[PDB]
Design a protein around this motif. Sequence first.
Motif, mmCIF file in Angstrom:
data_model
loop_
_atom_site.group_PDB
_atom_site.id
_atom_site.type_symbol
_atom_site.label_atom_id
_atom_site.label_comp_id
_atom_site.label_asym_id
_atom_site.label_seq_id
_atom_site.Cartn_x
_atom_site.Cartn_y
_atom_site.Cartn_z
ATOM 1 N N UNK A 48 9.156 -74.355 -13.977
ATOM 2 C CA UNK A 48 9.243 -74.078 -12.587
ATOM 3 C C UNK A 48 10.560 -74.891 -12.319
ATOM 4 N N UNK A 49 10.463 -76.213 -12.623
ATOM 5 C CA UNK A 49 11.691 -77.144 -12.436
ATOM 6 C C UNK A 49 12.985 -76.317 -12.821
ATOM 7 N N UNK A 50 13.107 -76.022 -14.254
ATOM 8 C CA UNK A 50 14.488 -75.412 -14.777
ATOM 9 C C UNK A 50 14.892 -74.044 -14.196
ATOM 10 N N UNK A 51 13.676 -73.249 -13.857
ATOM 11 C CA UNK A 51 14.076 -71.961 -13.085
ATOM 12 C C UNK A 51 14.785 -72.439 -11.916
ATOM 13 N N UNK A 52 14.226 -73.221 -10.933
ATOM 14 C CA UNK A 52 14.923 -73.820 -9.623
ATOM 15 C C UNK A 52 16.054 -74.196 -10.040
ATOM 16 N N UNK A 98 6.117 -77.989 -3.083
ATOM 17 C CA UNK A 98 5.661 -78.853 -2.318
ATOM 18 C C UNK A 98 4.106 -78.584 -2.078
ATOM 19 N N UNK A 99 3.651 -77.263 -2.292
ATOM 20 C CA UNK A 99 2.338 -77.051 -2.154
ATOM 21 C C UNK A 99 1.354 -77.272 -3.243
ATOM 22 N N UNK A 100 1.982 -76.769 -4.317
ATOM 23 C CA UNK A 100 0.986 -76.948 -5.688
ATOM 24 C C UNK A 100 1.411 -78.076 -6.644
ATOM 25 N N UNK A 101 2.648 -78.482 -6.680
ATOM 26 C CA UNK A 101 2.940 -79.400 -7.744
ATOM 27 C C UNK A 101 2.844 -80.693 -7.281
ATOM 28 N N UNK A 117 4.326 -85.775 -8.943
ATOM 29 C CA UNK A 117 4.276 -84.328 -9.394
ATOM 30 C C UNK A 117 3.127 -84.226 -10.312
ATOM 31 N N UNK A 118 2.477 -83.129 -10.470
ATOM 32 C CA UNK A 118 1.462 -82.657 -11.475
ATOM 33 C C UNK A 118 2.299 -81.891 -12.479
ATOM 34 N N UNK A 119 1.722 -82.094 -13.784
ATOM 35 C CA UNK A 119 2.475 -81.548 -14.909
ATOM 36 C C UNK A 119 1.959 -80.097 -15.427
ATOM 37 N N UNK A 120 0.696 -79.839 -15.715
ATOM 38 C CA UNK A 120 0.104 -78.854 -16.210
ATOM 39 C C UNK A 120 -0.956 -78.361 -15.465
ATOM 40 N N UNK A 121 -0.964 -76.818 -15.229
ATOM 41 C CA UNK A 121 -1.701 -76.219 -14.355
ATOM 42 C C UNK A 121 -2.659 -75.080 -15.117
ATOM 43 N N UNK A 122 -3.718 -74.580 -14.587
ATOM 44 C CA UNK A 122 -4.367 -73.496 -14.770
ATOM 45 C C UNK A 122 -3.851 -72.440 -14.102
ATOM 46 N N UNK A 123 -4.302 -71.125 -13.914
ATOM 47 C CA UNK A 123 -3.897 -70.088 -13.407
ATOM 48 C C UNK A 123 -4.230 -70.002 -11.904
ATOM 49 N N UNK A 124 -4.924 -70.896 -11.538
ATOM 50 C CA UNK A 124 -5.267 -71.197 -10.327
ATOM 51 C C UNK A 124 -4.294 -72.229 -9.533
ATOM 52 N N UNK A 125 -3.410 -72.600 -10.354
ATOM 53 C CA UNK A 125 -2.507 -73.652 -9.831
ATOM 54 C C UNK A 125 -2.907 -75.245 -9.836
ATOM 55 N N UNK A 162 -4.587 -79.727 -14.731
ATOM 56 C CA UNK A 162 -5.521 -79.790 -15.805
ATOM 57 C C UNK A 162 -5.541 -80.972 -16.310
ATOM 58 N N UNK A 163 -4.663 -82.014 -16.304
ATOM 59 C CA UNK A 163 -4.442 -83.224 -17.103
ATOM 60 C C UNK A 163 -3.961 -84.197 -16.261
ATOM 61 N N UNK A 164 -4.648 -85.531 -16.470
ATOM 62 C CA UNK A 164 -4.268 -86.458 -15.660
ATOM 63 C C UNK A 164 -2.864 -87.211 -16.344
ATOM 64 N N UNK A 165 -1.819 -86.662 -15.850
ATOM 65 C CA UNK A 165 -0.692 -86.974 -16.592
ATOM 66 C C UNK A 165 0.734 -87.016 -15.498
ATOM 67 N N UNK A 166 1.203 -88.155 -15.650
ATOM 68 C CA UNK A 166 2.643 -88.558 -14.810
ATOM 69 C C UNK A 166 3.491 -88.848 -15.488
ATOM 70 N N UNK A 167 4.930 -88.100 -15.253
ATOM 71 C CA UNK A 167 6.109 -88.024 -16.115
ATOM 72 C C UNK A 167 7.151 -88.564 -15.088
ATOM 73 N N UNK A 168 7.487 -89.879 -15.353
ATOM 74 C CA UNK A 168 8.270 -90.480 -14.314
ATOM 75 C C UNK A 168 9.490 -89.885 -14.240
ATOM 76 N N UNK A 169 10.126 -89.390 -15.303
ATOM 77 C CA UNK A 169 11.347 -88.881 -15.438
ATOM 78 C C UNK A 169 11.493 -87.653 -14.631
ATOM 79 N N UNK A 170 10.635 -86.674 -14.929
ATOM 80 C CA UNK A 170 10.653 -85.444 -14.314
ATOM 81 C C UNK A 170 10.506 -85.798 -12.872
ATOM 82 N N UNK A 171 9.761 -86.594 -12.315
ATOM 83 C CA UNK A 171 9.532 -86.730 -10.807
ATOM 84 C C UNK A 171 11.172 -86.906 -10.049
#
Length: 388
Positions: free
Chosen positions: A186-190, A217-220, A228-236, A239-248
């Motif tokens: 989603x980030x790189x599409x944006x 804003x709403x999901x990530x 920011x959250x990193x990995x999601x199921x189809x319900x947004x 699904x993982x407790x992961x923070x990626x400081x660089x992505x944020x």
Amino acid sequence: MNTFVNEFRNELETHILPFWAKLKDDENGGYYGLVDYDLHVHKDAGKGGIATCRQLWAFSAAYRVLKKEAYLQQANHAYRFLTEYVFDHQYKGLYWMVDYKGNPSDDRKHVYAQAFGVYALTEYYRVTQNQEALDYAKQLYKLIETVGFNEETNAYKEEFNRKWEEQSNEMLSENGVIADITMNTHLHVLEAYTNLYRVWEDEQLKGRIANLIDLFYEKVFDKQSKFLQVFFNNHWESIIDLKSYGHDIEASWLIDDALKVTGNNDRKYTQMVIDIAYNIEKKGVLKDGSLAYENENGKIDYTRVWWVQVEAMVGFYNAYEKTKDEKFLKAVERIWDYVKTYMIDSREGGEWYWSVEADGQPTKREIAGPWKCPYHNARFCLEFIERV
């Protein structure tokens, strides 16, 4: 501040871009696919589709900002390889990998790669007005919007086979339970679509950008933790407790660019940009001023990864522009000192190291290859040049 920016421009023009120019592959096209930690150049290595996009983006942008004709010549060489070999002229879209002669080696079609194509092709268009390049960009946009987009979930998709048939659409295994939706894609599409709108002010595209921003804003974005959250199921649902400081911190200033290019003055989005930057200044920066990589479960990976440092410098400087909070300027200065001290390779033949361990030693990983190219570090230098 002119002092710091002259140091970045010097780094760019005298170290970074000459290193990448020495990988120009005249016989087989594009750029040699691998430089290992020990500075052997593997001329027969595989050539990444994304790497090729990033090479095109970096040289095109360098030319836009700095206007040296050598940079345009590099950009042209990248464009040729991208459109001649990486693009699949039969089933359309960019291959994941090609071999050193441009034959498909990993012919999967990933939305992430198609996004990078749009981003690079639009940048090349900015400096050439090559109508073919823009048409190519629009074709990839069309793919992403149709076959690469899930109407049901409101989410861009991941991985397809060559013939655009949805595969194990995840972040390749590892997960254990795989992600259906990723922040990264989603980030790189944006990012890509921001650049497309600069060159093609289409109202529908504008709406696709507004949609991505709202998904961020709403999901990530976790409005409590400010991560920011990193990995999601189809319900947004994450699904993982992961923070990626660089992505944020990257997302902070990329979303802001998306806001600026489309005239979106919605206050919650602006506040998101700012809150992320504060969050990462407080939670990601180590006592030496460098940034950690990830926090998975409770556990912090203290590896200093090259792209994380430069995205932090850009995002923190953007934040400084919006807040006039010296905290951000100080943060930028201290990352830069760390980067000059530990991350920029002083070997003849070298560029930047992939990463640095907590002990201060370089990680023995490749300097150039499918996942390490000049986009992040060039873009950082260019952003400061243009902002100042």
